mmCIF file of C-alpha atoms and ligand atoms in Angstrom:
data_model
loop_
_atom_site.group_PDB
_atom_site.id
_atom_site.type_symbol
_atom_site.label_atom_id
_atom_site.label_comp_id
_atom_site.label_asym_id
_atom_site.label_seq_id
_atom_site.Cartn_x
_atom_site.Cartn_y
_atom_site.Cartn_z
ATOM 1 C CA UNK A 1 40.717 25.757 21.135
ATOM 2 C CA UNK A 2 42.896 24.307 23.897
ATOM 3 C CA UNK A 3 43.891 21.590 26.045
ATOM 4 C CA UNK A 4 42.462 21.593 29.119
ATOM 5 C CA UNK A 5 39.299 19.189 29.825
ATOM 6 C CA UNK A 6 36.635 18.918 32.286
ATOM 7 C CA UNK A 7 36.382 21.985 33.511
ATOM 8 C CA UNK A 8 33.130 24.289 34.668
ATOM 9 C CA UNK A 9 33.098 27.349 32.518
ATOM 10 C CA UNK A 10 31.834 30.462 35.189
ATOM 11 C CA UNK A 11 32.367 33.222 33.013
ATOM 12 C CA UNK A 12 33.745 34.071 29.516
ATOM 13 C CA UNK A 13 36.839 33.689 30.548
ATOM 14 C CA UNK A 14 37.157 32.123 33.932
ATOM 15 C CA UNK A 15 36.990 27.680 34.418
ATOM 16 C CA UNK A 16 37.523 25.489 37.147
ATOM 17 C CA UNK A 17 38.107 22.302 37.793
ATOM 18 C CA UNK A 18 39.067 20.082 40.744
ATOM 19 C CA UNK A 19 42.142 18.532 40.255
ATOM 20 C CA UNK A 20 45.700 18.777 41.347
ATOM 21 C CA UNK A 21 47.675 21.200 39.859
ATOM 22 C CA UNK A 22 50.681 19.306 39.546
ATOM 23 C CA UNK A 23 48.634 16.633 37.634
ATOM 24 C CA UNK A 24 46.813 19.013 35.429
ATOM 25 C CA UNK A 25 50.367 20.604 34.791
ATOM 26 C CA UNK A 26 51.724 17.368 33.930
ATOM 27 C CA UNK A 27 49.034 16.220 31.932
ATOM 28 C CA UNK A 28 48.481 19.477 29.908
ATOM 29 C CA UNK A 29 52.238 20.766 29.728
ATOM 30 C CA UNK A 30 50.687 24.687 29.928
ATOM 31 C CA UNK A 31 52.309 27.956 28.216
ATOM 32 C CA UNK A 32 51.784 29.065 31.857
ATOM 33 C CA UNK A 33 51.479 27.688 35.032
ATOM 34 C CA UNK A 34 51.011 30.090 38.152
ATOM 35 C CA UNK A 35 52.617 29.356 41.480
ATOM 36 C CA UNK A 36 51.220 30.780 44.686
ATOM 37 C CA UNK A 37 54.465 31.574 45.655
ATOM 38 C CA UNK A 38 55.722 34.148 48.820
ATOM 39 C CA UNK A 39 58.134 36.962 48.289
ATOM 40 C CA UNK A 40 60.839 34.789 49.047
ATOM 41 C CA UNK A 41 60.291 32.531 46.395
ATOM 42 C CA UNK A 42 60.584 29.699 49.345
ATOM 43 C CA UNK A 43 58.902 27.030 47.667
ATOM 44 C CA UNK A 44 58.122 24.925 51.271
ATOM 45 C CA UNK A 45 54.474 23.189 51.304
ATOM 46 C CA UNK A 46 50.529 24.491 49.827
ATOM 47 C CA UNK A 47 50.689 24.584 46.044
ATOM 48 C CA UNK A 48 54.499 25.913 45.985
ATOM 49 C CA UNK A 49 55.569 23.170 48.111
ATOM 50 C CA UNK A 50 54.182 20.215 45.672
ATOM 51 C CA UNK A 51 54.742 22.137 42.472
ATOM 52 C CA UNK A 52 58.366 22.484 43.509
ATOM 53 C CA UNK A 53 58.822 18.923 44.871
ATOM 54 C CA UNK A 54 57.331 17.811 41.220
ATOM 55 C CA UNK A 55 60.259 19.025 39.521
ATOM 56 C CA UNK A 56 62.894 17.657 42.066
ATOM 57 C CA UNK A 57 63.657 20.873 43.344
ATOM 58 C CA UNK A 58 64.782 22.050 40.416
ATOM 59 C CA UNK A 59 62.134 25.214 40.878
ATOM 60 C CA UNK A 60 63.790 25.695 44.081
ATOM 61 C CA UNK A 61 67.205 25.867 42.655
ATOM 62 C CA UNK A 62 66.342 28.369 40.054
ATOM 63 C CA UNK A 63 64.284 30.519 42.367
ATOM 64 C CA UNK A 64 67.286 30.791 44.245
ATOM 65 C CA UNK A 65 69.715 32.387 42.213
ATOM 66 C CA UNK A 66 66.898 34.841 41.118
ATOM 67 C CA UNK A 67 66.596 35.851 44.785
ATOM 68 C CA UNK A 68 70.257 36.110 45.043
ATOM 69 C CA UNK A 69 70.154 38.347 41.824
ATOM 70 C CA UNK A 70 67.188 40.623 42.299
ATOM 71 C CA UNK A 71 65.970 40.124 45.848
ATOM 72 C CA UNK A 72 62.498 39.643 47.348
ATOM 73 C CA UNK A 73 59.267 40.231 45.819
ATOM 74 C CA UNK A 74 56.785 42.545 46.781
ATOM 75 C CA UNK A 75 53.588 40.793 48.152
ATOM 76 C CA UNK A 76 50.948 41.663 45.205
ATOM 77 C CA UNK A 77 54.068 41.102 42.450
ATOM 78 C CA UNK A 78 55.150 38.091 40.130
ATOM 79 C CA UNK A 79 58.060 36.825 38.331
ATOM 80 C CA UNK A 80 58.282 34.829 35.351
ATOM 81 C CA UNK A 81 60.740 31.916 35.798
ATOM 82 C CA UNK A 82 61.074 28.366 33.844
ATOM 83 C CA UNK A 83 58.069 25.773 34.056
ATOM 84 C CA UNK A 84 60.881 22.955 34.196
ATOM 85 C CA UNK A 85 58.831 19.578 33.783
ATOM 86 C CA UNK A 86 55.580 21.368 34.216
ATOM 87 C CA UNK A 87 55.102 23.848 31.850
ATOM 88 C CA UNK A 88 56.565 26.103 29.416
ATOM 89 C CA UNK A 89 56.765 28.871 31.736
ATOM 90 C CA UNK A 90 55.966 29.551 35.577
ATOM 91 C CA UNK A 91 54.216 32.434 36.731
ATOM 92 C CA UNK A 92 55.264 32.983 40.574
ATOM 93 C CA UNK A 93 52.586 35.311 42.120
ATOM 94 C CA UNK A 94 52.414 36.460 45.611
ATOM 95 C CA UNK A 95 49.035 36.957 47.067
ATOM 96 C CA UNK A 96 48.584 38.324 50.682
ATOM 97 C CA UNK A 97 49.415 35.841 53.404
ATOM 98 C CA UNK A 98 46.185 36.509 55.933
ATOM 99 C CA UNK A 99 48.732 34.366 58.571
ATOM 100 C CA UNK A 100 51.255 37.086 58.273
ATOM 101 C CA UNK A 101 48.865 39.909 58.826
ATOM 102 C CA UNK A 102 49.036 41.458 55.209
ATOM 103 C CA UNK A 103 46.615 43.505 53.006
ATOM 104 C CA UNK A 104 43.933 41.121 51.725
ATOM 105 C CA UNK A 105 43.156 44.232 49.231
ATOM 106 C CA UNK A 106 46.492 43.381 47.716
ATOM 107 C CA UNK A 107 45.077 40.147 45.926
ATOM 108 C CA UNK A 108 43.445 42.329 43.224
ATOM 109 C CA UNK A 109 46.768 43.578 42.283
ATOM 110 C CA UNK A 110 48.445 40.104 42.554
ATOM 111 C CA UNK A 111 45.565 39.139 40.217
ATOM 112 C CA UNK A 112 46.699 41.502 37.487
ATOM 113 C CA UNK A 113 49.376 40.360 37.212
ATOM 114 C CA UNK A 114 47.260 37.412 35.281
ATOM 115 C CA UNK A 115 46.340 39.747 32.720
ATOM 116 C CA UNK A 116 50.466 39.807 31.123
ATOM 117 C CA UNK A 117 49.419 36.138 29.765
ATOM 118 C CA UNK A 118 46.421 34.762 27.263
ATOM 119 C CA UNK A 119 46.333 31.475 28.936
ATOM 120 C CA UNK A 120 47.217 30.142 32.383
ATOM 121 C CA UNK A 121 46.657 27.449 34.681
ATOM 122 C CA UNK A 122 46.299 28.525 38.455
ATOM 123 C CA UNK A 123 45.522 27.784 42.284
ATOM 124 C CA UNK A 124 43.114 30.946 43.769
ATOM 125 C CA UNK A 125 45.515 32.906 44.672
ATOM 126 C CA UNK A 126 45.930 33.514 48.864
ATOM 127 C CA UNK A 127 43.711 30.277 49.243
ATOM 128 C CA UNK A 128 44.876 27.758 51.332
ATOM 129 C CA UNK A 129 47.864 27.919 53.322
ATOM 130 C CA UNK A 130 47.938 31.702 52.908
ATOM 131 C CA UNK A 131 44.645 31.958 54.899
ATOM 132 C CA UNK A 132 42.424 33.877 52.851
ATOM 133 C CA UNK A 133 38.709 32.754 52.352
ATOM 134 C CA UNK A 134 38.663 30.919 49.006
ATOM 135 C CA UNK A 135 35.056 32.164 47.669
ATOM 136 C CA UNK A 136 36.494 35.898 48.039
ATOM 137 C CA UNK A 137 39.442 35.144 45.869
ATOM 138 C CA UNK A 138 37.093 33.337 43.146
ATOM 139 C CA UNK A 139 35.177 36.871 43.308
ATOM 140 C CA UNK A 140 38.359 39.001 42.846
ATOM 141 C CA UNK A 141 39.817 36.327 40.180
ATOM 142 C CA UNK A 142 36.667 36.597 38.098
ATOM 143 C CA UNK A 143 36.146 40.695 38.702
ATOM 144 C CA UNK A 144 39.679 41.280 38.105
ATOM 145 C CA UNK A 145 41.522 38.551 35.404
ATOM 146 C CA UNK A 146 40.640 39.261 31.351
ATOM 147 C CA UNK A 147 42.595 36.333 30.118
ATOM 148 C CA UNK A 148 41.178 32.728 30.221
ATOM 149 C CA UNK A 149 41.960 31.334 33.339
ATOM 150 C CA UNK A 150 41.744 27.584 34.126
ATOM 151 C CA UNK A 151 41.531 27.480 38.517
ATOM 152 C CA UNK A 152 42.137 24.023 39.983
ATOM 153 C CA UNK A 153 40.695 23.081 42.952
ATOM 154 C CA UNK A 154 42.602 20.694 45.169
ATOM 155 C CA UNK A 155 40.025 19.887 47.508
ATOM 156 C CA UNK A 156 37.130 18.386 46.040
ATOM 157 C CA UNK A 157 34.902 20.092 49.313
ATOM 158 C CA UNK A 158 35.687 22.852 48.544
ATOM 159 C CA UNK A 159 35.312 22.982 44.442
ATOM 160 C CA UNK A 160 31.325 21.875 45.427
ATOM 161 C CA UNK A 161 31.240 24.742 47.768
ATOM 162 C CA UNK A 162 32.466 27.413 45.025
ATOM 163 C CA UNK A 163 30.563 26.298 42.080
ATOM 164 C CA UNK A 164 27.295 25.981 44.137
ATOM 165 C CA UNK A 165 27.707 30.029 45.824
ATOM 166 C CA UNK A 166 29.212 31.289 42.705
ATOM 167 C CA UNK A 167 27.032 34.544 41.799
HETATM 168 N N1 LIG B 201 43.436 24.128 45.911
HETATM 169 C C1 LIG B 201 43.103 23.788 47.246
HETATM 170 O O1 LIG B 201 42.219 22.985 47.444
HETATM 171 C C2 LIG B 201 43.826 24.435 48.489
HETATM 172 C C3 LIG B 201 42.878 25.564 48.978
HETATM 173 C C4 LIG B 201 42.824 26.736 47.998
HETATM 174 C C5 LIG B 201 44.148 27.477 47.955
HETATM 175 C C6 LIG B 201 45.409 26.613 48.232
HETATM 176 C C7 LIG B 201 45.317 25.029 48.215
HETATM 177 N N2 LIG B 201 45.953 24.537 46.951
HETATM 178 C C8 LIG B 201 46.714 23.359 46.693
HETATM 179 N N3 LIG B 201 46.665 22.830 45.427
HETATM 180 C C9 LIG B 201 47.399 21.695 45.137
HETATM 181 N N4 LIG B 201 48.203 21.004 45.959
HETATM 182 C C10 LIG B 201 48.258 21.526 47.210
HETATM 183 C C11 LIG B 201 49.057 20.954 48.265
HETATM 184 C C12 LIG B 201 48.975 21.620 49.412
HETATM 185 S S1 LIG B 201 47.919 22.992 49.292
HETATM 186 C C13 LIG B 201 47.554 22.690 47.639
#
């Protein structure tokens, strides 16, 4: 038994809500939290942008010095960093940015990387800002993650539209 509330359950492991992550986050206080981040770890606008804004930049700060330490990211890879006022822990993944031109078959592996933690609270990964079509990422989240998974939704258009062509 855990925290989270209201959500759709689509498969044994897989729920989803709409809601805004940064309010779940704050509400529930997760073990994990997952940022859509890029390799960068450039936390300007989509889910990155409002996740890092909610903890007054401190996310920025920190991903920072990790750039400065290890460098970029590979697109498809993660990095576990703090979850400052949001959660225990923050789980940055990089999906494929379809605006930069890159591999959409790389958001299976950036999905894996789900698999490394029981419990997490996530955006689809590559959705929004990063261009990808949302219902494909709900396919290769649910086809590819074996840990429960709790998906919020931003848009509440959109959450209708998933639930109702979910296979
Ligand atoms: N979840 C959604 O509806 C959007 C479409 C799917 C993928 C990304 C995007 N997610 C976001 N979630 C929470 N806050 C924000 C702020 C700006 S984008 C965003």
């Amino acid at each position: 038994v855990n925290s989270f509330s209201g959500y759709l359950k689509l498969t044994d492991n897989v729920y989803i809500k709409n809601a805004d992550i940064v309010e779940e986050a704050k509400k529930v206080k997760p073990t994990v939290v997952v940022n859509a981040a890029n390799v960068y770890l450039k936390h300007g606008g989509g889910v990155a942008g409002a996740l890092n804004k909610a903890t007054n930049n401190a996310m920025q700060v920190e991903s920072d010095d990790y750039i400065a330490t290890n460098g970029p990211l590979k697109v498809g890879g993660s990095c576990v960093l703090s979850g400052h006022n949001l959660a225990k822990h923050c789980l940055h993944v990089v999906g494929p940015n379809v605006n930069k031109g890159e591999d959409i078959q790389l958001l299976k592996s950036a999905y894996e990387n789900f698999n490394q933690h029981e419990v997490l609270l996530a955006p689809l990964l590559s959705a929004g800002i990063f261009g990808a079509d949302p219902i494909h990422s709900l396919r290769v989240c649910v086809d590819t993650v074996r840990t429960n998974v709790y998906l919020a939704v931003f848009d509440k258009n959109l959450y209708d539209k998933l639930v109702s062509s979910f296979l």
